[PDB]
Amino acid sequence: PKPILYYDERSPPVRSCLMLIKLLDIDVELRFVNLFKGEQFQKDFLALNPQHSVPTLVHGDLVLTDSHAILIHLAEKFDEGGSLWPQEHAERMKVLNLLLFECSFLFRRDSDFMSAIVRQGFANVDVAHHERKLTEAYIIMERYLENSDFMAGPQLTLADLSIVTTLSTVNLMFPLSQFPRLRRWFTAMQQLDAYEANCSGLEKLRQTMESVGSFQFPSSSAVVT
Amino acid sequence: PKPILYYDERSPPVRSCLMLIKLLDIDVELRFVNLFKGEQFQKDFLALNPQHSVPTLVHGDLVLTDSHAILIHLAEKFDEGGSLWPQEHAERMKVLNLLLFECSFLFRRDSDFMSAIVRQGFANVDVAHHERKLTEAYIIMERYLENSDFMAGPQLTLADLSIVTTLSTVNLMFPLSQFPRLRRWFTAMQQLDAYEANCSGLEKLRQTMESVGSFQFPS
Numbered sequence: 200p201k202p203i204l205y206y207d208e209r210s211p212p213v214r215s216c217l218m219l220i221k222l223l224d225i226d227v228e229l230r231f232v233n234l235f236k237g238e239q240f241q242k243d244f245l246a247l248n249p250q251h252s253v254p255t256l257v258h259g260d261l262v263l264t265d266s267h268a269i270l271i272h273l274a275e276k277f278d279e280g281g282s283l284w285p286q287e288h289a290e291r292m293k294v295l296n297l298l299l300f301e302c303s304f305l306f307r308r309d310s311d312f313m314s315a316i317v318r319q320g321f322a323n324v325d326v327a328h329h330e331r332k333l334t335e336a337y338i339i340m341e342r343y344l345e346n347s348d349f350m351a352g353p354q355l356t357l358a359d360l361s362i363v364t365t366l367s368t369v370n371l372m373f374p375l376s377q378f379p380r381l382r383r384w385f386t387a388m389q390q391l392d393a394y395e396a397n398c399s400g401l402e403k404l405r406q407t408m409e410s411v412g413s414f415q416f417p418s419s420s421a422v423v424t
Numbered sequence: 425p426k427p428i429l430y431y432d433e434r435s436p437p438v439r440s441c442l443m444l445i446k447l448l449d450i451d452v453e454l455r456f457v458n459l460f461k462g463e464q465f466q467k468d469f470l471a472l473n474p475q476h477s478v479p480t481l482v483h484g485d486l487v488l489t490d491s492h493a494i495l496i497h498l499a500e501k502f503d504e505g506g507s508l509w510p511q512e513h514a515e516r517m518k519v520l521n522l523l524l525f526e527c528s529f530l531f532r533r534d535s536d537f538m539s540a541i542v543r544q545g546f547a548n549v550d551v552a553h554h555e556r557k558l559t560e561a562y563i564i565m566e567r568y569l570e571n572s573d574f575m576a577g578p579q580l581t582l583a584d585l586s587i588v589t590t591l592s593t594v595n596l597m598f599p600l601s602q603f604p605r606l607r608r609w610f611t612a613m614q615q616l617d618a619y620e621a622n623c624s625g626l627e628k629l630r631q632t633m634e635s636v637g638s639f640q641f642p643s
């Protein structure tokens with residue numbers, strides 16, 4: 200049976216899976232779970248994923264509840280022997296290490312910021328606090344890109360797919376003017392045909408966040424090429 | 425070159441790596457980075473790990489900056505053919521999924537709570553809020569244990585090592601009496617020879633958090 204992806208394209212980790220699905224031309228059934236309406240708490244989805252989170256993948260008997268596991272699973276089954284999830288051990292561990300950076304550091308801090316907007320309203324958020332936290336993530340990614348051309352090495356990997364969706368979401372708010380390597384990398388990612396799968400959900404996220412938070416992202420921040 | 429582990433054993437993700445090292449009898453060189461003194465911001469360590477986090481593993485030219493990658497790396501290098509990191513794809517994906525649950529959900533919420541204590545002081549923390557968030561993690565793990573003796577199946581895996589160190593840290597504040605599968609599992613984990621690697625740092629974390637937070641854990 201072909202994979203089933205429970206999704207809300209506003210979510211960066213969902214969009215990372217959408218990019219991989221487009222990149223590898225995987226046939227996947229899409230099942231929308233509207234996070235704005237709380238559909239992740241629907242009884243059947245909750246029993247499927249007690250974390251009530253998207254993306255969730257059902258592929259046969261396998262149920263994955265984290266984008267980073269979904270990316271690895273889909274790469275092993277549809278990019279077998281390929282370079283997105285590289286064959287050599289050290290290269291693969293480097294990709295895994297950056298996937299975990301996305302979970303542990305980048306997405307955690309972006310989610311922290313957007314959760315404060317939803318709960319308090321943008322005018323009541325300590326924006327300077329979150330600017331510091333997320334600029335710190337910019338600094339770290341700039342350092343990674345000072346030593347390699349893509350995030351995890353000389354070529355595109357799963358790490359770039361995971362990170363670029365959250366980047367583009369952070370960059371709705373915070374400009375990349377002071378980060379030339381990260382701007383060059385982001386521009387290169389935007390030229391990829393697979394990046395088309397990030398565009399619609401990023402814009403839907405912008406619309407929803409501006410509505411719920413009663414604010415506007417500064418239009419000048421987002422890198423657009 | 426033998427692996428080098430930069431560590432502060434107060435940290436649950438550090439303790440998971442220490443448990444695996446004891447389980448597999450891995451010869452490592454330990455290097456203490458005192459987080460209480462801010463030594464993770466020392467110039468050479470930031471150069472090595474710009475996330476200024478422990479655990480950090482240096483193994484030859486490979487530098488790993490996340491406990492979950494370190495667990496997988498060490499299992500693949502030192503436990504080929506073991507059950508901790510299963511060879512079968514579906515089983516391996518299940519372990520990976522639970523390792524990411526630990527990063528994304530359990531440790532995130534435990535770190536949220538302990539960071540509130542450090543920044544605000546225990547007397548000013550919304551304990552009820554964090555009790556709800558962490559009890560939600562208990563509920564999820566209790567469901568994970570419905571069909572299996574361990575988190576990822578019938579056998580001990582890397583997922584149990586990652587989860588149990590954070591468990592025991594959450595359990596310093598919130599008891600497990602309402603979660604029979606989870607309490608059974610934790611008692612069984614505590615009986616492992618390798619669980620001794622968790623003991624020292626858990627107590628050091630209790631002592632340090634109680635001083636920095638100016639409080640005492642109920643346990």
Ligand SMILES: N[C@@H](CCC(=O)N[C@@H](CS[C@H]1C(=O)c2sccc2N(Cc2ccc(F)cc2)S1(=O)=O)C(=O)NCC(=O)O)C(=O)O
Pocket residue numbers: 207209210211212234235236239250251252253254264265266267302310311313314315317404407408524528
């Ligand atoms: N490691 C896991 C992470 C999976 C996960 O957490 N998925 C959630 C959606 S991602 C998300 C988020 O956390 C927050 S907090 C505030 C705003 C947002 N997001 C924007 C958003 C706003 C409004 C809206 F209607 C939709 C989205 S977000 O960036 O999308 C998730 O499913 N949350 C549901 C829940 O109940 O927790 C991994 O897969 O990698």
Ligand SMILES: N[C@@H](CCC(=O)N[C@@H](CS[C@H]1C(=O)c2sccc2N(Cc2ccc(F)cc2)S1(=O)=O)C(=O)NCC(=O)O)C(=O)O
Pocket residue numbers: 299303432434435436437459460461464475476477478479489490491492527535536538539540542629632633636
């Ligand atoms: N996914 C990564 C996570 C790696 C990581 O974040 N490691 C940190 C130590 S774990 C840690 C923690 O996050 C917090 S927040 C508040 C309290 C604590 N900890 C307790 C503590 C208190 C006082 C003290 F002196 C030491 C510890 S904690 O549980 O130890 C880390 O290195 N932080 C340093 C930094 O600058 O960020 C993975 O590896 O899995």
